[PDB]
Structure 1
Amino acid sequence: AIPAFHPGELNVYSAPGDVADVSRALRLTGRRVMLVPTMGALHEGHLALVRAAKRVPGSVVVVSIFVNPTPDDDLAQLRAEGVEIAFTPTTAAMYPDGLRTTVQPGPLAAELEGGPRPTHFAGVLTVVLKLLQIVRPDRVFFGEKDYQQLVLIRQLVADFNLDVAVVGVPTVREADGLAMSSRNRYLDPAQRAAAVALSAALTAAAHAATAGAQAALDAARAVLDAAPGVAVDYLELRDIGLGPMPLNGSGRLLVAARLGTTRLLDNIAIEI
């Protein structure tokens, strides 16, 4: 028997087998299954992931809420957007044999964010793989804010021959350009004001780039240097797959910085 599912309502499932069965049944009825993986505390960046998923014709949207080891609020937000499935497993349900077979990323995981957090991406890719196998979506949606993460997921998909489409959704930003993040609330007024330097550096670089890569890097560095209390961890221009930047062509510029105790990240498309 398929678990109960009411079209056009929010249906909540905490058991991996239940969401798996419902998803399978829905695919067999027409629908194109979309997955938006989250850690809850839904914000406007997640709204953008959900909206992108909703507009695929014949979509049913699954939003997972899972913290790797309000809910009331999150669920009402999903209802308001017309999401039909929430998948809300316990740690036990995801890891019933505990930590055992895992995903080992390629060497990109050791670079950039992998310096301060050398095992973080192993966890991310392990959980993303599991969610993909459980839900079996046609398309999975991620923000571009965590660009290295996104690139690693694309590697996962290519490397293990997964049959899902990975969709990256442009970063949602505050009115001054600060990339949305659960961390922004912690900034005091001076830090919040300084934090605009990250996005201003990157947008300056993207426009400076007609004058070449060095001009782009030097423009972003100059903007970051205008900001007090912004400790830059890295500022790197790479190809779009995060290898070495080619002489000209498309790239990505990534920054990370610490403001007081808070780490912020941002990145942007660059054309040289």
Structure 2
Amino acid sequence: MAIPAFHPGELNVYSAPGDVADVSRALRLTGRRVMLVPTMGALHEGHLALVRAAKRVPGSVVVVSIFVNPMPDDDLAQLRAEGVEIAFTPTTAAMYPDGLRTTVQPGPLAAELEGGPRPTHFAGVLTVVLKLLQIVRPDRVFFGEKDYQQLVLIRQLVADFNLDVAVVGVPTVREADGLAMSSRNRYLDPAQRAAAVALSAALTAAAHAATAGAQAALDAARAVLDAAPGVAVDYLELRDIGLGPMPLNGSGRLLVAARLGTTRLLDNIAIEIG
């Protein structure tokens, strides 16, 4: 049967998985490289940074998915203003026509850090990311480094299941004072918003303290967190770039999570030791 209509240079919106699959296949056959930016809508400047990263690949056609995963006019207007040509907006029923059945089970990393208090959270994410990859079949898929544990788990999924996509991590877009962009930032009252800059300040202080070794980096970040009121730290850990044990010197990642009132915030940063 017929490929659904695709109008080059305009925003084309599809909610049926088979439709975007068919258009994506047709476009790839035409000499486009299909770039996927998965989102849950309510798009912000961090999402736009993913889009801009994707658009600049020569030959790109950009697919932005908007799917709120149980396990609008404004969004489309922003994507049109960015020159995005495909929005994929499926219903929960289209994604899960047989309900919850076969799912992805992450490796033991999912049980650490964010996976601590609820060991099935990343299973939901990795399941939908796998489905979006198979539907759209992109050459590259773009995520922010903000949810870094998530991002490492997606790289694990791609390696472990032999998937033919490149995973591109885009540096986290931040507010002017360093706070990492987040849908949750608008819930902070002004005292909480002022205190919240300690997460990014702690991590940047650590990244610079790290010429003096790992202990100095951790101690500098802890002192900065300790200078902030109402910031209940859930963890502060230095790991290697794959989230295993930090090697004695070399590259790592420093991750923090804290609760301010009812709002949980996360941040992370690249660390080079000595």
For normalisation by structure 2, the TM-score amounts to 0.99
Give CA-to-partner distance per residue, 1:207-253, whole Å, 9 cap, x none. 00000000000000000000000000000000000000000000000
Quote the Cα distance in structure 2 between the aligned partners of 1:5 and 1:179. Answer: 36
For structure 1, which runs of at least 5 residues remain unmatched after alignment? none
Q: Is the 2:71–2:125 Cα contact (8 Å) retained in structure 1?
A: no
- Alpha-carbon shift at residue 116 of structure 1 (Å): 2.5
Quote the Cα distance in structure 2 between the aligned partners of 1:151 and 1:68. Answer: 20
Give CA-to-partner distance per residue, 1:108-137, whole Å, 9 cap, x none. 000000013321100000000000000000
Report the secondary structure of 2:183's partner residue.
Answer: coil
**2:271 maps to 1:270:** yes
Quote the Cα distance in structure 2 between the aligned partners of 1:70 and 1:189. Answer: 32
Give CA-to-partner distance per residue, 1:52-111, whole Å, 9 cap, x none. 000000000000000011900000000000000000000000000000000000000000
Quote the Cα distance in structure 2 between the aligned partners of 1:70 and 1:49. Answer: 23
Report the secondary structure of 1:142's partner residue.
Answer: strand
**2:100 maps to 1:99:** yes
RMSD between aligned residues: 1.3
Q: Is the 1:11–1:85 Cα contact (8 Å) retained in structure 2?
A: yes
How many residues of Structure 1 are paired with residues of Structure 2 in the alignment? 272
Aligned to 1:83: 84
Quote the Cα distance in structure 1 between the aligned partners of 2:256 and 2:153. Answer: 17
Q: Is the 2:149–2:243 Cα contact (8 Å) retained in structure 1?
A: yes
Q: Is the 1:197–1:224 Cα contact (8 Å) retained in structure 2?
A: yes
Quote the Cα distance in structure 1 between the aligned partners of 2:96 and 2:21. Answer: 16
Aligned to 1:45: 46
Quote the Cα distance in structure 2 between the aligned partners of 1:249 and 1:188. Answer: 39
Quote the Cα distance in structure 2 between the aligned partners of 1:70 and 1:211. Answer: 43
Q: Is the 1:41–1:70 Cα contact (8 Å) retained in structure 2?
A: no
Q: Is the 2:172–2:180 Cα contact (8 Å) retained in structure 1?
A: yes
Report the secondary structure of 1:206's partner residue.
Answer: helix
Change beyond 3 A, Cα 1:71–1:241 = same
